[PDB]
C-alpha cells in the first residue's frame, strides 16, 4: 500500500540527453537516431530573444555554429532545419542508446514525467500534469530548456513535451516534439499570461478512489447525487464538468472499491462545500488533481516497464 507521486524510470531518456551550444546560449537537446532536437531559441542572443525573426536568424547560421556535446564526446552537425518551434540538427552519428519511441501530443488533464536537465546532464525526475490552461507547474531554472516530458509503455517512450520558457506567474510552457506549443504562447520574451485555470474533476475522483483503496474512508457517505446536480456544484467551485465518459473511465475503480461513481461525486460535493475540518487525505490537506485514473490503477496494482 501507499500512494506517492511517481515518475517513470528515466534511464531510457537519460541516454538521449545532450548539450547544444550556439554562441552564448547553452541548452539541452534530445538525441534520437541521427537527429538532435532542441528549442529553436538556441540560435538567439539576448537582444534576439526580445522579438526574434527565427527564419532570418537561421539562414545566417552554419552547421559549425552548433556545438553538440554527448557527455565528453563532440558530435559533428551535418545538417540543420527548423520544424515550427524546434530545431532539428542532423549529426554524423546515430545514438546507439535510442529507445523505441513515439512523438505524441497529450491532452490537458493527462500526466507525464519530466527529466530536468542542465548542460546535457540529468538533474532530477518528477511528475507533472498538463493544466487545463496548457501550462505545467514544473521546476525549471535557467539552462533547463530542451528537457523533455514523457510516458513509458513497456519499452516504448512516448515523448510529449519539450521545455521552452517560464511565464510571469512561475508556471512553465513548452511544445510537443513537433515544435507546436501547448496553449496560446510564443517563444518570445514578452508579456504572456497563462489564462484562467480549472480543477481536473475526473482526476480528483480518481485520487479519492486511491484513498479508499489505501484505507482513508472518513469522507465517504450514504448520500448520492445525479450527474447534472453534481455539475452545478462543480461549476461553482471552478471544477471541470464531469461527462459520462469520465464516469465510464472511473468504472474499474468503482468496481474495485464498490463505491458508485455518483456516490463518490456526492462525497466530493460535501468536501467542496465543507472543507476537510482539519483532516487529511493520502497525506494532503487539499483535493489533489494531478493523478489520472490510469496513474491510480498503475500504482495501486503495480505495472512495470522493460
Ligand X SMILES: *[C@H](O)[C@H](C[C@@H]1CCNC1=O)NC(=O)[C@@H]1[C@@H]2[C@H](CN1C(=O)OC(c1ccc(F)cc1)c1ccc(F)cc1)C2(C)C
Q: How far is the CB of 54 from a second copy (least distance, A)?
A: 26
144 versus 151: smaller Cβ distance to ligand X: 144
Site of grid cell 539562414: 59
Write down the catalytic residue from 38, 117, 145, 265.
145
146 versus 293: smaller Cβ distance to ligand X: 146
Asked if 257 contacts 213 with a C-beta cutoff of 8 angstroms, the reply is yes
* Known catalytic membership, residue 41: yes
Site for ligand X (CB under 6 A): which residue of 172, 194, 208, 268?
172
Site residue total, a second copy (CB under 8 A): 53
Asked if 269 contacts 257 with a C-beta cutoff of 8 angstroms, the reply is no
Cα 224 vs. chain centroid, distance in angstroms?
A: 34
Q: Is 168 in the site for ligand X (CB under 6 A)?
A: yes
231 versus 257: smaller Cβ distance to ligand X: 257
The DSSP code for 96 is T
| CA gap 105, 162 in Å, rounded | 11
Q: Which does 27 bind (CB under 5 to 8 A by kind): ligand X, a second copy, none?
A: ligand X
For residue 73, give the C-alpha cell: 564526446
| CA gap 203, 211 in Å, rounded | 12
Contacts of 58 (CB under 8 A, 6+ apart): 40, 43, 80, 82, 87
Q: How far is the CB of 217 from ligand X (least distance, A)?
A: 17
Cα 210 vs. chain centroid, distance in angstroms?
A: 21
Q: Which residues pair with 90 in a beta bridge?
A: 35, 79
Site for ligand X (CB under 6 A): which residue of 12, 41, 131, 246?
41
* Known catalytic membership, residue 38: no
Q: Which of residues 229-288 bind a second copy (CB under 8 A)?
A: 280, 283-286
Site for a second copy (CB under 8 A): which residue of 99, 101, 106, 137?
137
Q: Which does 189 bind (CB under 5 to 8 A by kind): a second copy, ligand X, none?
A: ligand X
Write down the catalytic residue from 22, 38, 41, 44.
41
135 versus 231: smaller Cβ distance to a second copy: 135
Contacts of 266 (CB under 8 A, 6+ apart): 221, 223, 224, 225, 230
Neighbours of 11 (CB within 10 A): 13
Site for a second copy (CB under 8 A): which residue of 37, 118, 209, 239?
118
One DSSP character per residue, 223-238 reads ----HHHHHHHHHHTT
Q: Is 115 in the site for a second copy (CB under 8 A)?
A: yes
Give me the active site residues, please.
41, 145
Binding residues for a second copy, rule: CB under 8 A, are 1-12, 14-15, 71, 115-119, 121-126, 128, 137-141, 143-144, 166, 170-172, 214-215, 280, 283-286, 298-299, 301-306
Amino acid at each position: 500500500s501507499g500512494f506517492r507521486k511517481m515518475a517513470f524510470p528515466s534511464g531510457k531518456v537519460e541516454g538521449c540527453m545532450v548539450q547544444v551550444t550556439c554562441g552564448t546560449t547553452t541548452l539541452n537537446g534530445l538525441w534520437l537516431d541521427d537527429v538532435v532536437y532542441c528549442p529553436r531559441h538556441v540560435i538567439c542572443t539576448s537582444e534576439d530573444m526580445l522579438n526574434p525573426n527565427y527564419e532570418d536568424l537561421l539562414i545566417r547560421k552554419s552547421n559549425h555554429n552548433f556545438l553538440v556535446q554527448a557527455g565528453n564526446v563532440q558530435l559533428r552537425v551535418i545538417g540543420h532545419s527548423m520544424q515550427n518551434c524546434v530545431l532539428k540538427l542532423k549529426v554524423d552519428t546515430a545514438n546507439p542508446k535510442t529507445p523505441k519511441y513515439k512523438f505524441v501530443r497529450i491532452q490537458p488533464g493527462q500526466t507525464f514525467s519530466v527529466l530536468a536537465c542542465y548542460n546535457g546532464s540529468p538533474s532530477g525526475v518528477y511528475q507533472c500534469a498538463m493544466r487545463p490552461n496548457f501550462t505545467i507547474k514544473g521546476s525549471f531554472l535557467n539552462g533547463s530548456c530542451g528537457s523533455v516530458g514523457f510516458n513509458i509503455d513497456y519499452d516504448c517512450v512516448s515523448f510529449c513535451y519539450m521545455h521552452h520558457m517560464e511565464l510571469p506567474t512561475g508556471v512553465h510552457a513548452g511544445t510537443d516534439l513537433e515544435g507546436n506549443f501547448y496553449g496560446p504562447f510564443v517563444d518570445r520574451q514578452t508579456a504572456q499570461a497563462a489564462g484562467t485555470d480549472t480543477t481536473i474533476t475526473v482526476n480528483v475522483l480518481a485520487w479519492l478512489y486511491a484513498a479508499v483503496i489505501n484505507g482513508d474512508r472518513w469522507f465517504l457517505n450514504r448520500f448520492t447525487t445525479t450527474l447534472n446536480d453534481f455539475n452545478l456544484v462543480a461549476m461553482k467551485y471552478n471544477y471541470e464538468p464531469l461527462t459520462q465518459d469520465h464516469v465510464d473511465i472511473l468504472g474499474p475503480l468503482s468496481a474495485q472499491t464498490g463505491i458508485a461513481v455518483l456516490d463518490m461525486c456526492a462525497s466530493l460535493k460535501e468536501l467542496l462545500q465543507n472543507g476537510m475540518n482539519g483532516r487529511t487525505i493520502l497525506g494532503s490537506a487539499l483535493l489533489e488533481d494531478e493523478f489520472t485514473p490510469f496513474d491510480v490503477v498503475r500504482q495501486c496494482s503495480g505495472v512495470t516497464f522493460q
